[PDB]
Amino acid sequence: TDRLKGKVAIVTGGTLGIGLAIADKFVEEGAKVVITGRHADVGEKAAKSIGGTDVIRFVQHDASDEAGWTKLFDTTEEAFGPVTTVVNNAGIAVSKSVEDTTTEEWRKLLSVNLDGVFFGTRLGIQRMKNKGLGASIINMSSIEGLVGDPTQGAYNASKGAVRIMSKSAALDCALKDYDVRVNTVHPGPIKTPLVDDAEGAEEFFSQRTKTPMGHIGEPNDIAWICVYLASDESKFATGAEFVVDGGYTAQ
Amino acid sequence: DRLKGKVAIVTGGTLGIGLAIADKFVEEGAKVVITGRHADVGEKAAKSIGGTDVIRFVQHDASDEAGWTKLFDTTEEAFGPVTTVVNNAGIAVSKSVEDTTTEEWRKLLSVNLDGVFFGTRLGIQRMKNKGLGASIINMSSIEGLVGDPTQGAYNASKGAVRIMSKSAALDCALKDYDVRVNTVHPGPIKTPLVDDAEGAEEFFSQRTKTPMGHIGEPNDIAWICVYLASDESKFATGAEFVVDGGYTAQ
Amino acid sequence: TDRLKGKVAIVTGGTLGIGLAIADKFVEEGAKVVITGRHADVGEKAAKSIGGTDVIRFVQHDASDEAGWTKLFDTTEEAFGPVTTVVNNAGIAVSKSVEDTTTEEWRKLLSVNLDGVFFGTRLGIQRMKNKGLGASIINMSSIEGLVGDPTQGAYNASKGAVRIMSKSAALDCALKDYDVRVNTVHPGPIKTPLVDDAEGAEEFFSQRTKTPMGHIGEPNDIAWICVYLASDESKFATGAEFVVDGGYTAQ
Amino acid sequence: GMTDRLKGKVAIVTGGTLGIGLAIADKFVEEGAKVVITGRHADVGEKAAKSIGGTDVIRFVQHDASDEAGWTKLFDTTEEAFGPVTTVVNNAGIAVSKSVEDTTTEEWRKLLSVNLDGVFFGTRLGIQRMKNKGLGASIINMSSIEGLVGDPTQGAYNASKGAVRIMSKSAALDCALKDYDVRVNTVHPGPIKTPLVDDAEGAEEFFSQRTKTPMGHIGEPNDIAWICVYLASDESKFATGAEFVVDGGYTAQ
Numbered sequence A, C: 001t002d003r004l005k006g007k008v009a010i011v012t013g014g015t016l017g018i019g020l021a022i023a024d025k026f027v028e029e030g031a032k033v034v035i036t037g038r039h040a041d042v043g044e045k046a047a048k049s050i051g052g053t054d055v056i057r058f059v060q061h062d063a064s065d066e067a068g069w070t071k072l073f074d075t076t077e078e079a080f081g082p083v084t085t086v087v088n089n090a091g092i093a094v095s096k097s098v099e100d101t102t103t104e105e106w107r108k109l110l111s112v113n114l115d116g117v118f119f120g121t122r123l124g125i126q127r128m129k130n131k132g133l134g135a136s137i138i139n140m141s142s143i144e145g146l147v148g149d150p151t152q153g154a155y156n157a158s159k160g161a162v163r164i165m166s167k168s169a170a171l172d173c174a175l176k177d178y179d180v181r182v183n184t185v186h187p188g189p190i191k192t193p194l195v196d197d198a199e200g201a202e203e204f205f206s207q208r209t210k211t212p213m214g215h216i217g218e219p220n221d222i223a224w225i226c227v228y229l230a231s232d233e234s235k236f237a238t239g240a241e242f243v244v245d246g247g248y249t250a251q
Numbered sequence B: 001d002r003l004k005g006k007v008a009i010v011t012g013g014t015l016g017i018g019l020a021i022a023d024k025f026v027e028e029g030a031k032v033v034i035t036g037r038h039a040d041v042g043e044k045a046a047k048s049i050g051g052t053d054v055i056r057f058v059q060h061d062a063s064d065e066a067g068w069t070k071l072f073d074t075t076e077e078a079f080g081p082v083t084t085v086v087n088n089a090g091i092a093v094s095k096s097v098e099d100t101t102t103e104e105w106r107k108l109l110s111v112n113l114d115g116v117f118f119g120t121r122l123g124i125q126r127m128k129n130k131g132l133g134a135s136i137i138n139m140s141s142i143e144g145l146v147g148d149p150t151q152g153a154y155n156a157s158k159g160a161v162r163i164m165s166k167s168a169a170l171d172c173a174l175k176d177y178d179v180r181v182n183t184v185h186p187g188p189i190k191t192p193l194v195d196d197a198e199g200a201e202e203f204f205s206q207r208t209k210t211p212m213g214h215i216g217e218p219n220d221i222a223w224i225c226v227y228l229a230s231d232e233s234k235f236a237t238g239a240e241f242v243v244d245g246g247y248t249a250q
Numbered sequence D: 001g002m003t004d005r006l007k008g009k010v011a012i013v014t015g016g017t018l019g020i021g022l023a024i025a026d027k028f029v030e031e032g033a034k035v036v037i038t039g040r041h042a043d044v045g046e047k048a049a050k051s052i053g054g055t056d057v058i059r060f061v062q063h064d065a066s067d068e069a070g071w072t073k074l075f076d077t078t079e080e081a082f083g084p085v086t087t088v089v090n091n092a093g094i095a096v097s098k099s100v101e102d103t104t105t106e107e108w109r110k111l112l113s114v115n116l117d118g119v120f121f122g123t124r125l126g127i128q129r130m131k132n133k134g135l136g137a138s139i140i141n142m143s144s145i146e147g148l149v150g151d152p153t154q155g156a157y158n159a160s161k162g163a164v165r166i167m168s169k170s171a172a173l174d175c176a177l178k179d180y181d182v183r184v185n186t187v188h189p190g191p192i193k194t195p196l197v198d199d200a201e202g203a204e205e206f207f208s209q210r211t212k213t214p215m216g217h218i219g220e221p222n223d224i225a226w227i228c229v230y231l232a233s234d235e236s237k238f239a240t241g242a243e244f245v246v247d248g249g250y251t252a253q
């Protein structure tokens, strides 16, 4: 009945919001999980809120830190065995149009939202290919990887990059019989610290012209689609886009 | 227990993909009515999954508009109010657009398009505003996303199902109907549809078609339908769920 | 330079709106054109509003009438020579949700919007293949073949069918070296009698939350993308979706 | 038609000295535009410009699209030659034949500096310089079929072209909502016979397979030039935020 029995997952940015719920439901379904974040304070309380060191641990790591990724995999391996699942969830937002984006804002967002996903995906492939683990890489895009937003230009670029880079990775792993799948998840608006800290964002995005359901989602909405994609239930799904958005992109 | 309390109709549930959707729906607590055109096959399919306390066969052609109300009525009497409709019944025709006879055109669309419309329309009418966490799952295909030179009418039917389903999803969402509508897009799946087409599995296992080098199995489509039928997916509507071994990613 | 020199086009529903502008710009660029429509009064006016019978003629033909398609082609070939271009433009709308759509309404719309495009595409391929014509079939879909509309359920079905069926036809023609291309055009809202007759449609579609440009298009907006698709300029374009919609589907 | 379709337009075409960009510049001049082409190598660029016309209609400017400060000089130079810029074709791009697994971090950053940062610099500057001027301005960003589907041996390239695809929609929406009179669209060529393809041994043969390109051959630069003329002209005044795919059927299957 444990849908993730034997799986061991790295969830970047798993200390708040969507990443927190992903790790929560991963542990509930039998996986061992390492959550990462930049603030060690909020991190280990997040992990303790889910369970003990036998099922979940916290490793301080900036997803843009290339070298840290090797240590992150090493640490997770020593803790729970070989890594089977990578959720590249860490990401940041910038409320600027393309016109108004400074080059510093552009580079900073892309180093987390794109370079970090690249680092996790590249290393994930190298470290789990050809081990018969039913391995799965889950890259967090967004509906902003599918449609534009006039005030999120850099974010749009990063999530569109993640969308298609993930298909390249999925195809290579499939053609080479690596036993690694790569898919992208595309949440619509979700009630998280990111949305909560943007004044009026939930009210704006609950407009029926934005989200037809008339409300935004909860972090568990994204957690459950990630459980499906991490499990061997989805052993035929690779290179695909999984959209959980209240109908946002359907109009 | 992921479908606790759900009551599902699965059209074309006696073979292939539909049979596996029924199997896993029962396994997760749903009560299920499967349909098909042949009573022999249907009764054997239903008892192969469980007793009449959890699964039953109803003879119904999905293109039979009048039978759709009877089918809901029969399911409601057995199991209570329907919460879940899987419009899975469909047929194929191996013909290019150029070579498609109008008889073949009309016949395939009457099942693959008209039947999905009948089930979706009736499902909205019978499930809205009842707090059932209702979910309509419309079986499209990768052939609703990309073309196939020798499947012209099938392509037409599956593209229609893809976009019509978004219309329904939006209307239900904007009206607070408590009904979600999504489409599932399988790649090649080992089923009687594929088994009885000589050479098909060998053809579609080519890496230029399916990058995984093999075709899927009916349970690959059952598990995404379980997700879509369950309250776990309460924020998913109007979306396309593609399970295809990488077919459309290249 | 006539960008459609020597072309011979059938434009269904070419007496009003988008079809009328398509025929107008086709003859301006050197094509000979036959436009069809059901009302002979409007249709005769439209032809001579554009040119003489040496460049354009009107044929009364219902696009849903399968037998008339053979005589429409026959009549066009006898008038101007072998057809090189079919734009399947005739179409109707029904303002009903899926839930509210009667089977009568469903069947009427699809008979024109889908069956008619099928009849013209199937016969277009048969009559134009293997003739060195640089043949081009332009099937009029819509943004409603890309996104849903809660109050145009049958219309959504018809335009999604046109979108993907055309890909099948394009692939078959290209793999068999037929020298026929097949593409779909997806207008956003366009000021036409179809839109004018629906009360409030222009105002609804001009909202920025619908069309970001804040206004709807004009028939010439679709005529010019069709000239591109009918001309040999587009000899490498097949199986593709050409979206002219004021940004409607980009958000 | 009887009129120059780009009469009065002033276009910057990055990477306009070879291949697709060279053909865009050539057909732009044919349709009445004044054009500045860029590239990193002045030997190629000066010959490319003269191969199309005199300095009254086309000029070369040496500029690496990844060089942000040079973008300002490039617009200044173009304005001084021809007046206000109306059309920006972000075409400069490079390829790297590596899977995601096999991509070195320096390969990643180098390709994205050109294919992504350069398109961002040109789009941002283009909006700033062309907005609110009544020019019928148009920004054409060169994506690829590889911004629509994956390629197992072009991981960084895929990332860059997916980014260009969606970043362009953001810009199109902002320009439209603000009445800037600037449209932004992406072009998605399939395989095209260019020096880029010519220098990758076996690439044309591979992409000519029917399982890749259903027409059984790859395109030619003029195929992309003509859709760019359409997008640059006022003919396309209602087209923004959209993807224009000219690929021989590659993505239709």
Ligand SMILES: NC(=O)c1ccc[n+]([C@@H]2O[C@H](COP(=O)([O-])OP(=O)(O)OC[C@H]3O[C@@H](n4cnc5c(N)ncnc54)[C@H](OP(=O)(O)O)[C@@H]3O)[C@@H](O)[C@H]2O)c1
Pocket (backbone or CB within 6 Å): A012, A013, A014, A015, A016, A017, A018, A019, A036, A037, A038, A039, A040, A042, A061, A062, A063, A064, A089, A090, A091, A092, A112, A140, A141, A142, A143, A186, A187, A188, A189, A190, A191, A192, A193, A194, A195
């Ligand atoms: N919420 C939405 O509406 C929504 C919609 C679509 C997509 N998404 C995507 O979903 C993902 C999660 O978003 P969220 O809304 O849950 O964000 P959130 O509530 O702000 O949480 C982000 C998490 O990522 C961590 N993080 C941020 N930068 C990091 C870095 N450089 N290295 C490592 N960890 C980092 C944060 O921890 P520290 O602050 O301690 O680093 C935090 O745990 C993001 O990729 C976002 O783009 C969100």
Ligand SMILES: NC(=O)c1ccc[n+]([C@@H]2O[C@H](COP(=O)([O-])OP(=O)(O)OC[C@H]3O[C@@H](n4cnc5c(N)ncnc54)[C@H](OP(=O)(O)O)[C@@H]3O)[C@@H](O)[C@H]2O)c1
Pocket (backbone or CB within 6 Å): B011, B012, B013, B014, B015, B016, B017, B018, B035, B036, B037, B038, B041, B060, B061, B062, B063, B088, B089, B090, B091, B111, B139, B140, B141, B142, B185, B186, B187, B188, B189, B190, B191, B192, B193, B194
């Ligand atoms: N297999 C694939 O590779 C694949 C891929 C993508 C999508 N799909 C789609 O998935 C669905 C299931 O396909 P499958 O491969 O499982 O097909 P299958 O093995 O041929 O099974 C078809 C099922 O539908 C029933 N059926 C056929 N016509 C019907 C009608 N008019 N009314 C009611 N029931 C009918 C059949 O029972 P009776 O014959 O007794 O009626 C049978 O139970 C179809 O919509 C198909 O288009 C399949």
Ligand SMILES: NC(=O)c1ccc[n+]([C@@H]2O[C@H](COP(=O)([O-])OP(=O)(O)OC[C@H]3O[C@@H](n4cnc5c(N)ncnc54)[C@H](OP(=O)(O)O)[C@@H]3O)[C@@H](O)[C@H]2O)c1
Pocket (backbone or CB within 6 Å): C012, C013, C014, C015, C016, C017, C018, C019, C036, C037, C038, C039, C040, C042, C061, C062, C063, C064, C089, C090, C091, C092, C112, C140, C141, C142, C143, C186, C187, C188, C189, C190, C191, C192, C193, C194, C195
């Ligand atoms: N206008 C828009 O906003 C818009 C947007 C996206 C797509 N479209 C599509 O563009 C196409 C043209 O639309 P429009 O707005 O130009 O329409 P319109 O103004 O209503 O004109 C439609 C034309 O088609 C003819 N027609 C209608 N039914 C026909 C039939 N069964 N057989 C032959 N001809 C027929 C009409 O003449 P008779 O009445 O005399 O037959 C008329 O000439 C349609 O496919 C529509 O779905 C329109």
Ligand SMILES: NC(=O)c1ccc[n+]([C@@H]2O[C@H](COP(=O)([O-])OP(=O)(O)OC[C@H]3O[C@@H](n4cnc5c(N)ncnc54)[C@H](OP(=O)(O)O)[C@@H]3O)[C@@H](O)[C@H]2O)c1
Pocket (backbone or CB within 6 Å): D014, D015, D016, D017, D018, D019, D020, D021, D038, D039, D040, D041, D044, D063, D064, D065, D066, D091, D092, D093, D094, D114, D142, D143, D144, D145, D188, D189, D190, D191, D192, D193, D194, D195, D196, D197
């Ligand atoms: N060929 C295809 O099949 C194909 C398909 C889809 C998309 N594309 C895209 O189309 C665009 C043009 O490709 P192509 O095949 O024509 O390439 P190409 O034959 O290699 O020509 C590239 C042009 O860009 C210039 N260039 C390269 N790097 C540059 C930089 N950093 N700054 C400024 N200019 C630079 C080159 O000149 P210098 O080297 O002298 O700078 C040359 O003028 C690229 O974005 C490519 O990704 C091509």
Ligand SMILES: [Mg+2]
Pocket (backbone or CB within 6 Å): A147, A248, A249, A250, A251, C147, C248, C249, C250, C251
């Ligand atoms: Mg939208």
Ligand SMILES: [Mg+2]
Pocket (backbone or CB within 6 Å): B146, B247, B248, B249, B250, D149, D250, D251, D252, D253
């Ligand atoms: Mg493909």
